[PDB]
């Protein structure tokens, strides 16, 4: 039940590389500096807005015909592979 004071500002600031930045803006993002969770929010919102997830099996994301394919470099992926995706996300951004 112990809390520590002062509490730290432990939010990762990032700057998406050009391609990733293009996707975030296509859904509504207007910044060029983001926190990590802001990135995941807009990105998941991108997949659902672009209707890239499979309807019957909703962990499969098809991006072969979409700019997201260029971003990750795969024709399709499964969000179940937390490890593999977390890597593709950071190859497209630098930690500020």
């Amino acid at each position: 039940t112990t809390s520590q004071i002062p509490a730290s500002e432990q939010e990762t600031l990032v700057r998406p590389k050009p391609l990733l930045l293009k996707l975030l803006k296509s859904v509504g993002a207007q910044k060029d500096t983001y926190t990590m969770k802001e990135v995941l929010f807009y990105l998941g919102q991108y997949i659902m807005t672009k209707r890239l997830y499979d309807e019957k099996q909703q962990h499969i994301v098809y991006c072969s015909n979409d700019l997201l394919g260029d971003l990750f470099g795969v024709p399709s992926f499964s969000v179940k592979e937390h490890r593999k995706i977390y890597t593709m996300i950071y190859r497209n951004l630098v930690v500020v």
Binding site: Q4, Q10, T12, M36, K37, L40, F41, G44, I47, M48, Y53, K56, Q57, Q58, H59, V61, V79, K80, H82, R83, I85, Y86, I89
Partner: protein, 349 residues
Amino acid sequence: KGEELFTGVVPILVELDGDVNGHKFSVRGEGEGDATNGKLTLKFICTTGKLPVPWPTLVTTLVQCFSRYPDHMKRHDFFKSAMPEGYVQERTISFKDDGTYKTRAEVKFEGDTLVNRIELKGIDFKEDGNILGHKLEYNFNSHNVYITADKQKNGIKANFKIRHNVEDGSVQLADHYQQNTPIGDGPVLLPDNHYLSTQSVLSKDPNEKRDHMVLLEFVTAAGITTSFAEYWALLSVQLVESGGALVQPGGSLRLSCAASGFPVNRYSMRWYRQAPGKEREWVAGMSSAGDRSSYEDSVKGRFTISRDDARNTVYLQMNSLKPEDTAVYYCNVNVGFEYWGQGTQVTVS
């Protein structure tokens, strides 16, 4: 069609023949099976004297066609689809740091009774070991059986690990590899990937003096309609897990866990932990009497488990914490049914 045989109670009859390390035995079992509730009540006896291996090691081998498939999963119930012709269930049980079971079974209706005929072989079991030494507590835990279609064999595969409670606090892993094929050449249902949640209670009949096991277990299926928004949020919090308890590399922490409804000093207690991108792993534990306490190799020498009988609490002193020790920590106990304590996020720098 085959699902219409399991409406209501169904009589069950199980017959196993086993050769473990040379030692031989047989088991007969009778009871009912209500597939509507995913419920089984069965009484098993060792018709050939007494059992050379623990009853808990034969549970998995001792009829998943009685599992409950909710309405939205009825197109994925392979087990009922194959009836009444039946299916063949082959499996390779690998006890870590010990021998291996190998079984072949046929589940099919005979008249109006669901009959499981089983053959079981066992090799490489250390004479002074957990299995042939009878070091396993008389209980069974709750497991998830991940099922996946096997198109080319026109059936299903299944991988899962059974956790057996050693009365010295440790846990005996039993890695199950499973395969199921129908007997008749008729149409069967190949399912999308799902899993079977299982709960089992082992008990004894007082009026029976034969070596016996009374077994009542519950099984239901799920895991086919998870939303992308959910799969994504799971990934999101993984990559941005803030944490609930934080320590520098080398610091120390003490975990508390208060028990309710059961006397903590009469059952064995164990600590589990699940790290990001990692499966639940047993950490520490102590015997119900308190004379023995076990620790996994990664934590031995800096973790200590204890308990306060009056306060009915269990503790886990953690010293020289590594970053590798970051995980969600749980307390475990099997009072017939396996129970889990509230999780605990410990984040090490």
